[PDB]
Ligand binder design. Structure first.
Ligand SMILES: Nc1ncnc2c1ncn2[C@@H]1O[C@H](COP(=O)(O)OP(=O)(O)O)[C@@H](O)[C@H]1O
Ligand SMILES: Nc1ncnc2c1ncn2[C@@H]1O[C@H](COP(=O)(O)OP(=O)(O)O)[C@@H](O)[C@H]1O
Ligand SMILES: OC[C@H]1O[C@H](O)[C@H](O)[C@@H](O)[C@@H]1O
Ligand SMILES: OC[C@H]1O[C@H](O)[C@H](O)[C@@H](O)[C@@H]1O
Length: 898
């Protein structure tokens, strides 16, 4: 009773109470929250690192893996087969590799060369060098991880201290060392902390396992947190294992009232002074040394060995944690004490043995009590997250100390259960080591890496390099030349059609005009009033009319009768009476014009297919339909492409506007060409607006090297298969179908929607590009991308939505770069043709995809700037539509009759 009582007094501060433990538990509860917070994380001592392991095993894991295990008391390499054969969950084989102090304390290169070598030897011996076994790495040190296959070493701890590793991705260093060998290939697909491996190993057996605990060389814990509490990981969806790195608790000085002189001593002479302070009161690397420091002070005070002090006793590290364990054994402890102390150079008495045993008890029990306190905090946190009165959970544990001390685990469990009386906790020893667990992570990581690889390979076909874009630019220029030249115009796919509009607005136009706008999303009839002079004005009125697909694809007589019926209506709607008014017809299809007011339809594009129209003058068609109605009369003065109307609308105010662009249902462009270059039109004086009909670029195969399997599909299922190829990679009518076809392929490969091709995904048109703009600028819940995808009819996961958003982006980005390259050809032709060093030019633009898409216009302007650097291009969106410009065209037309 005496001795122990006095020893209790001497080490009174090492013998913590339940009140103190509860205090410590509450301090740890607060550090966990700081760790997880985006505000305090940078200055949190308990790092709460995301591990990217979002579940314990589910039973679907299967494969043949290699697992490395570095950082604990032994460096191990294992080959782990999981459900690789029926009636054998797991099968394991292992090897320990001697890794002396000079490697652990030397250079990083030397360290990772050593790991690569042992891995080589391991594969060599088992002849598995060609099996392509995915590798998992258990690396028990704090790491910064943004994905499962990256591990940026934050700080060395425990016995390791190799230069050049802190701040480096150890996957990359390990890859580098293996490459240097040149002996074999190794696919490192996952890195995990040993706490995480333990949790996964135990989780494979028990589905209630939510915590991984190590009490070995060092100490740490991981547990399953809710994504909504993990501020540094995007998403509020589900759970993710957090590696607490609890050894660093108190590094800021918050446990200074618990720490003793002994703690301070061991810390000051360790490899990492002032770091991992909590761990230094708890783990196997330090307990023996704490005991030795206490025995030295006691000896010095003549409380032990009659003051005898040997140099062996004074040698740091000479009394290890194994000695503590031996000494605390029930029957042989005192005897072991005797032998152990006898070897210290002393001649310990029997009382000395009892005293030393008690010092070992106090040190090892304080450790157990401390870990109980911190684990209690994690258990309370889980209980709060689950929201129930009682907590049922399994803690998987590993570590030499916990496995070999004769009393520790018992005492730790007891105290833990006392401190968290609301929990029903099971402790499951991890008898197979971290490797089994690592393998389970590895299996999942490997499966996902294979899916990502295939998705990337598919999407890479849509990526266009700058050089590729410069080549598209070059080809567009080449086709422009072909269409403008007499010799080659007839077999040129980019027709370069004269519009018979020879100048931009001169400011004198004025009058009241009617105009039609046919071919885009909305058919419209307009009334436009233009007034010049002191303060010019334009006044416009319009009405949209529907054109059912049966009339768009019925007979020309029916289509024009419909147009005439809508004009009739609009005249009544506006109260237009009096003499026949001039009218400008914007008809957005390729026409061969012989004059402003004559235009023979060359082919239908987009969704129109009315019969007896192709090869007819559409002004004549309109004129005929007005005569059939025999009511109003009209003076059709002009037939105009929408590109050309758009340009004129923008050039009303901008003298630099000499280009028109449409990116809506279809895509096309127009620009002012010099008459000397327009060889299909007699005259070499002045300019002429040319309707490129650029949609058809590629119809001769010139873009076959960039069209993908999905482009081919869209064209093959289209109304005009083989035609308008360039347009089909850019415009509104087509991007949605490119996306849809990519989604279907990914769903069949099992990368999206659970492998379910929902009858509405199999339905063409459903990926409207209306929803393409919507999906491409979202929320963070992507809760937006969900209602879009569900309304139609599938059921996303947040992983799902993401993929859908990425696919959309790849398609729209390529569309805008393609569009850019064509525009880069047009402005550099204008520049180069006028002999200028730089060209300041405005492009009047319109179209629904251009107007509504969040990134199209930006990406496209950037491309133009990169591909034609000596041109400074301003893109001005029309507010008014083609109407103001069709009216201006009509005014000049009237004027030119006189
Ligand atoms: N909070 C504590 N901190 C340190 N040592 C303690 C503490 N509580 C009890 N002890 C010591 O632990 C021992 C009791 O061990 P315990 O596990 O409860 O019973 P047993 O003797 O079977 O191991 C005694 O040596 C006692 O002085
Ligand atoms: N939110 C959107 N994002 C991108 N493109 C869209 C969006 N909504 C509609 N579109 C596309 O815009 C096109 C129509 O534009 P346009 O040809 O100029 O017709 P209009 O202006 O007369 O309505 C369609 O092909 C449609 O798929
Ligand atoms: O090996 C046990 C623990 O040792 C240390 O404290 C390391 O920081 C931690 O990464 C590890 O989990
Ligand atoms: O409406 C935009 C474009 O769609 C198509 O490409 C039509 O051929 C073209 O004439 C029109 O400019």
């Amino acid at each position: 009773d005496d001795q122990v009582k006095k020893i209790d007094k001497y080490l009174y501060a090492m013998r913590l109470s339940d009140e103190t433990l509860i205090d410590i538990m509450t301090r740890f509860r607060k550090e966990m929250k700081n760790g997880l917070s985006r505000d305090f994380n940078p200055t949190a001592t308990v790092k709460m690192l995301p591990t990217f392991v979002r579940s314990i095993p589910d039973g679907s894991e299967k494969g043949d893996f290699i697992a490395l295990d570095l950082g604990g008391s032994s460096f191990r390499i294992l080959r782990v087969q999981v459900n690789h054969e029926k009636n054998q969950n797991v099968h394991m084989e292992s090897e320990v590799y001697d890794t002396p102090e000079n490697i652990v304390h030397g250079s990083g290169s030397q360290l990772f060369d050593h790991v690569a070598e042992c891995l080589g030897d391991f594969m060599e011996k088992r002849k598995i060098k060609d099996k392509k076994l995915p590798v998992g790495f258990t690396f028990s040190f704090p790491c910064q991880q943004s994905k499962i296959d990256e591990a940026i070493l934050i700080t060395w701890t425990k016995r390791f201290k190799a230069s050049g590793v802190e701040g480096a991705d150890v996957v990359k260093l390990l890859n580098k060392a293996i490459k240097k060998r040149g002996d074999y290939d190794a696919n490192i697909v996952a890195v995990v902390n040993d706490t995480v491996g333990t949790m996964m190993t135990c989780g494979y057996d028990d589905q209630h396992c939510e915590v991984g605990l190590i009490i070995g060389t060092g100490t740490n814990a991981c547990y399953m947190e809710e994504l909504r509490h993990i501020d540094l990981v995007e998403g509020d969806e589900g759970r993710m294992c957090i590696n607490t790195e609890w050894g660093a608790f108190g590094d800021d000085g918050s446990l200074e009232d618990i720490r003793t002189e002994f703690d301070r001593a061991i810390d000051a002479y360790s490899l990492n002074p002032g770091k991992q302070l909590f761990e230094k009161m708890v783990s196997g690397m330090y307990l023996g040394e704490l005991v030795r420091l206490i025995l030295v002070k006691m000896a010095k005070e003549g409380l032990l060995f009659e003051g005898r002090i040997t140099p062996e006793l004074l040698t740091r590290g000479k009394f290890n944690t194994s000695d503590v364990s031996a000494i605390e054994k029930n029957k042989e402890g005192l005897h072991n004490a005797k032998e152990i102390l006898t070897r210290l150079g002393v001649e310990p008495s029997d009382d000395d043995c009892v005293s030393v045993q008690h010092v070992c008890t106090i040190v090892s029990f304080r450790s157990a009590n401390l870990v109980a306190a911190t684990l209690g905090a994690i258990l309370n946190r889980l209980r709060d997250n689950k929201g129930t009165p009682r907590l049922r959970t399994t803690v998987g544990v590993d570590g030499s100390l916990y496995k070999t001390h004769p009393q520790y685990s018992r005492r730790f469990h007891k105290t833990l259960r006392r401190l968290v009386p609301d929990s029903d906790v099971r402790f499951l020893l991890s008898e197979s080591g971290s490797g089994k667990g690592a393998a389970m992570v590895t299996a999942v990581a490997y499966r996902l890496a294979e899916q990502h690889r295939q998705i990337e390979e598919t999407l890479a076909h849509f990526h266009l390099t700058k050089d590729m874009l410069l080549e598209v630019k070059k080809r567009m220029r080449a086709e422009m030349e072909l269409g403008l030249r007499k010799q080659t115009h007839n077999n040129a796919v980019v027709k370069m059609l004269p519009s018979f509009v020879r100048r931009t607005p001169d400011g004198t136009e004025n009058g009241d005009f009617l105009a039609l706008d046919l071919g885009g999303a909305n058919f419209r009839v307009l009334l436009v009033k233009i007034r010049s002079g002191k303060k010019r004005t334009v006044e416009m009125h319009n009405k949209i009319y529907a054109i059912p697909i049966e009339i768009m694809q019925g007979t020309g007589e029916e289509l024009f009768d419909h147009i005439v019926s809508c004009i009739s209506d609009f005249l009544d709607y506006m109260g237009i009476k009096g003499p026949r008014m001039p009218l400008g017809f914007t008809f957005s299809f390729p026409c061969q014009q012989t004059s402003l007011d004559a235009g023979i339809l060359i082919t239908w594009t987009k969704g129109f297919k009315a019969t007896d129209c192709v090869g007819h003058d559409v002004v004549t068609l309109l004129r005929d339909a007005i005569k059939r109605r025999e009511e109003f009369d009209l003076d059709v003065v002009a037939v105009v492409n929408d590109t050309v109307g758009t340009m004129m609308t923008c050039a009303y105010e901008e003298p630099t506007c000499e280009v028109g662009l449409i990116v809506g249902t279809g895509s096309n462009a127009c620009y002012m060409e010099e008459m000397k270059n327009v060889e299909m039109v007699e005259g070499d004086q002045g300019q002429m607006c040319i309707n490129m009909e650029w949609g058809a670029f590629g119809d001769n195969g010139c873009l076959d090297d960039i069209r993908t399997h999905y482009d081919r599909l869209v064209d093959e299922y289209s109304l005009n298969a083989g035609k308008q190829r360039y347009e089909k990679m850019i415009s509104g009518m087509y991007l949605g179908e490119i996306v849809r076809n990519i989604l279907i392929d990914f769903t069949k490969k099992g990368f999206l929607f659970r492998g379910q091709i929902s009858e509405t995904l199999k339905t063409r048109g459903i990926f409207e590009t209306k929803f393409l703009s919507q999906i491409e600028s979202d929320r963070l819940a992507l809760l937006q991308v969900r209602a879009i995808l569900q309304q139609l009819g599938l059921n996303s996961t947040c992983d799902d939505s993401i993929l859908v958003k990425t696919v959309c982006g790849v398609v729209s980005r390529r569309a805008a770069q393609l569009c850019g390259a064509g525009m880069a050809a047009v402005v550099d032709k204008i520049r180069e043709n006028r002999g200028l060093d730089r060209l300041n030019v405005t492009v009047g633009v319109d179209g629904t995809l251009y107007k509504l898409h969040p990134h199209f216009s930006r990406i496209m302007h950037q491309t133009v700037k990169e591909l034609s650097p000596k041109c400074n291009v301003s893109f001005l969106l029309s507010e008014d539509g083609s109407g103001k410009g069709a009216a201006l065209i009509t005014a000049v037309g009237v004027r030119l009759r006189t």
